Curated annotation (Swiss-Prot), chains B, C, D:
Belongs to the calmodulin family. This is Calmodulin-1. The lineage of its organism: Eukaryota, Metazoa, Chordata, Craniata, Vertebrata. It is found in: Cytoplasm, Cytoskeleton, Spindle; Cytoplasm, Cytoskeleton, Spindle pole; Cytoplasm, Cytoskeleton, Microtubule organizing center, Centrosome; Cell projection, Cilium, Flagellum. The modification Phosphoserine is found at residues 80, 100. The modification N6-acetyllysine is found at residues 20, 93. GO terms for cellular component: calcium channel complex; calyx of Held; catalytic complex; centrosome; cytoplasm; cytosol; growth cone; mitochondrial membrane. The gene is Calm1. The N-terminal and C-terminal lobes of CALM bind to the C-terminus of KCNQ1 in a clamp-like conformation. Binding of CALM C-terminus to KCNQ1 is calcium-independent but is essential for assembly of the structure. Binding of CALM N-terminus to KCNQ1 is calcium-dependent and regulates electrophysiological activity of the channel. The C-lobe interacts with KCNN4 channels in a calcium-independent manner, whereas the N-lobe interacts with the S4-S5 linker of KCNN4 in a calcium-dependent manner playing a role as calcium sensor and gating the channel. The keyword Methyltransferase does not apply.
């Protein structure tokens, strides 16, 4: 019983950790793309 | 005891992750789901005890302050890694450091709190367990404890 | 690790764009925006770490020399379209290439660092709107790689 | 700061031409109009800055010393053909100098300073701009600097 409870707890913990890592990476890429778009927008506005 | 606010914030973030309502209250099923998702180890008996304590109020939803109290009560109980090592050594009849995958699967499936065989296959695939090859209990315990 | 003069000129151009004064000095938030505009993608926690490292010791704001030093020491190419696709598949519980817009918004806002709702709305509108309510992350990664 | 007496005479004569009151000092709106007349390079934001500075002064007219000072402010820009030709090039996805009037004017008005519909119409008509075809900009900047 101890083994199985610890195992299921660890499995859900690993699931949560993978979710967190993927979310952090996706947020990082999203912010990078948004900043790139903002820089291009600033370029366009200045030239206009 | 008083819990560090960083841990409290992490617990709140974990709660909000699966809180499909966003109100800081969620069903006891996802309560246990995030309890395990925190890395802690509650017995299903303790899970049922906590569920009935919540159901005494009749809400069926885990408010964040009571959730934090539950977190503290879980922090009260802390098993050691050596205990898990000894438990696995008990099932290591050979004592060669390796245990059989099929017999461990049978142990999981037909002892105590039986769980789904798909979860057993999840253990096999995630812990790169060979179907018949002997698997070291110690490496499994270590990569389990890494968290 | 000195930077190419073309990149130096591009950095000064970005300074002119972001800074109304256009003196080559930008704030820490502006520092992070320029970091992420160049194509280098550090995390918000990472960006705060480098901000504390530089500490704006030049003139209270990230100026051109500190900017050059930061870009020199933090030069990397860790961003990979396949990595983004794998992370989105990790999001995709179904694994069909489509991730629920509501679930994605919940994860972005609640999990870890909280994204602004405007950012999530921008990402939703950036990708093609779908009848199922799920954003196709494959094409999303496609134009993330494109620009 | 201090300009050639030829430019001094030119500016005084432009004053007198636009000196409807005949005071000898040009009005703020008349200041902007003669800046547009003399090939100067004021920004709409810069024009409003000048207007509010004069309002703080309160006279409503531009004396010659401040006129020469903002001549210095203008010529510190030392703008040339090539930079804005490059800006058109980055706007000219064709890259041949021939640029589509529709998208160019949409970016010109929507992004940055916003133009009234009339101003766009007369500027398209009088600057040999085709209604929808690809129009060259190089001659326009060449006769910018020629004036």
């Amino acid at each position: 019983i101890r083994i199985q409870k610890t195992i299921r707890g660890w499995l859900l913990r690993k699931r949560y950790l993978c979710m967190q890592r993927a979310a952090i990476t996706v947020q990082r890429y999203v912010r990078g793309y948004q900043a790139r778009c903002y820089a291009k927008f600033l370029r366009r506005t200045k030239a206009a | 005891d008083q819990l560090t606010e960083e841990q409290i914030a992490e617990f709140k973030e974990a709660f909000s992750l699966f809180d499909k309502d966003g109100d800081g209250t969620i069903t006891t099923k996802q309560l246990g789901t995030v309890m395990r998702s925190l890395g802690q180890n509650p017995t299903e008996a303790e899970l049922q005890d906590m569920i009935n304590e919540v159901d005494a109020d009749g809400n069926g939803t885990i408010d964040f302050p009571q959730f934090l109290t539950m977190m503290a009560r879980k922090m009260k109980d802390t098993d050691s890694e050596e205990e898990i090592r000894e438990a696995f050594r008990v099932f290591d009849k050979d004592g060669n450091g390796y245990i059989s995958a099929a017999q461990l699967r049978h142990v999981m499936t037909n002892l105590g709190e039986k769980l789904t065989d798909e979860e057993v296959d999840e253990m096999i695939r995630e812990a790169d367990i060979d179907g018949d090859g002997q698997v070291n209990y110690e490496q499994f315990v270590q990569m389990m404890t890494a968290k």
